[PDB]
């Protein structure tokens, strides 16, 4: 038996190892009650953590705890997983061996720091760390690979080779969901819809996931958008009030590509890729042309495969067969693998272990893992 | 003739107006506007958006 919980820094999973689909999943959020002597007279636990916090969102002080992907507070982190184990997964976590996961190029003090209070606070004899883009192509289901992730705090390319992340030739970029949603508020206020309150925000969020699509020919998108009311699409907020959008559903997506509408100076994610491959070796590109992968929510949005595979083969020399790959359930897919991860028994082997723990202990995260 | 001046028939004039002074406030005018959602371009046949600002309000006080 092993555990599997996963932050693609927008909301997090929590499912049993070898499971097709997790047991839980929550938004990654954690919120305190705002008069401590209340809380400490109710016996009301200490925070609420996962929805039930959002359908108290007002009531009470939220805050987020992996922004930008990195670890904002150690102690609302373990809160969360607290909030996990327990509520959602009720297993003893001193029982059953629990994976956690990581963005790259974590500043090493993290690594230690979380293995020490996962490992001394929450008791599990055994535990083991990976990072997102690895367990996402354990759930393509290669060693080979190129992943795009995007879960809505943080966007990243990954070079993994048989198995193993070339450092160097990764790059951050931090233009992610939330980010998006900012601009689609924008854009949406100059029609004059002018969504600002938290409650309006995840509204937004909403019709990202309802209405968006990439374009592909953009210019021509926007055109035939000016040109006819036949591509609008309509909608209706929870207040009966109807909102309807054109050119923007397209529009607020191309911004990956076209970072400048945010102000930005970093190329578009495509672009950003292409110099990260260009990072990695010739010996190895073909490969990385082979499998192209995308992950994370971001790439909820429809057609996006068709526009990287276009984008990218222009900026590519034309001379590889390119090959986008959008696995359907590429969101969870980042769980998905390390639910498979961690049902391989040789990793039971793998596992940094008590014994060990107390001499190799913070370390071995560092020397002994991956 | 064309008698010279508009400002001639001004100072004929002789009244104060109905609301020009009683009405004078501190308050900022479009502090008072509530939000409200419907866009700049309604449709020919719904309100235009000015007039769901003052009708919610007016609604309101």
């Not at chain 1, 080979?144 to 080779?161: A, C, E, K, M, R």
């Not at chain 2, 700049?40 to 007016?58: A, T, Y």
Request: aromatic share 8%; glycine share 6%.
């Amino acid at each position: 038996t092993a555990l599997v919980c996963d932050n693609g820094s927008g909301l997090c999973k929590a499912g049993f190892a070898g499971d097709d689909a997790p047991r839980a999943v929550f938004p990654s959020i954690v919120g305190r009650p705002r008069h401590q002597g209340v809380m400490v007279g109710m016996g009301q636990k200490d925070s609420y953590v996962g929805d039930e916090a959002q359908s108290k969102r007002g009531i009470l002080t939220l805050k987020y705890p992996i922004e930008h992907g990195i670890i904002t507070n150690w102690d609302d982190m373990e809160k969360i997983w607290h909030h996990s184990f327990y509520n959602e997964l009720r297993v003893a976590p001193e029982e059953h061996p629990t994976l956690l996961t990581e963005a790259p190029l974590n500043p090493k003090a993290n690594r230690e720091k979380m293995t020490q209070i996962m490992f001394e606070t929450f008791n599990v004899p055994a535990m083991y760390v990976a990072i997102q883009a690895v367990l996402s192509l354990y759930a393509s289901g290669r060693t080979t690979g190129i992943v795009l992730d995007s879960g809505d705090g943080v966007t990243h390319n990954v070079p993994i080779y048989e198995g193993y992340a070339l450092p160097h030739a990764i790059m951050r970029l931090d233009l992610a969901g939330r980010d998006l949603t900012d601009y689609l508020m924008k854009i949406l206020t100059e029609r004059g819809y002018s969504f600002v309150t938290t409650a309006e925000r995840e509204i937004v969020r909403d019709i990202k996931e309802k209405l968006c699509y990439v374009a592909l020919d953009f210019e021509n998108e926007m055109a035939t958008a000016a040109s006819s009311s036949s591509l609008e699409k309509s909608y209706e907020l929870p207040d009966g009030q109807v909102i309807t959008i054109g050119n923007e559903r397209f529009r607020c997506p191309e911004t990956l590509f076209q970072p400048s509408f945010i102000g930005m100076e970093s190329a578009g994610i495509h672009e950003t890729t292409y110099n990260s491959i260009m990072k990695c070796d010739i010996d190895i590109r073909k490969d990385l042309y082979a499998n192209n992968v995308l992950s994370g929510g971001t790439t909820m949005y429809p057609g996006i495969a068709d526009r990287m595979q276009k984008e990218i083969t222009a900026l590519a020399p034309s001379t590889m067969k390119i090959k986008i790959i959008a696995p359907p359930e590429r969101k969870y897919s980042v769980w998905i693998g390390g639910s498979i991860l961690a049902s391989l028994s040789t990793f039971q082997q793998m596992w940094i272990s008590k014994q060990e723990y107390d001499e190799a202990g913070p370390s071995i995260v560092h020397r002994k893992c991956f | 003739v064309i008698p010279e001046d508009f400002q001639e028939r001004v100072e004929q004039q002789i009244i104060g107006a109905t609301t020009r002074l009683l009405t004078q406030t501190d308050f900022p005018l479009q502090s008072y506007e509530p939000k409200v959602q419907v866009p700049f371009q309604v449709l020919p046949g719904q309100c235009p958006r000015k007039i769901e600002i003052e009708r919610r309000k007016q609604q309101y006080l």
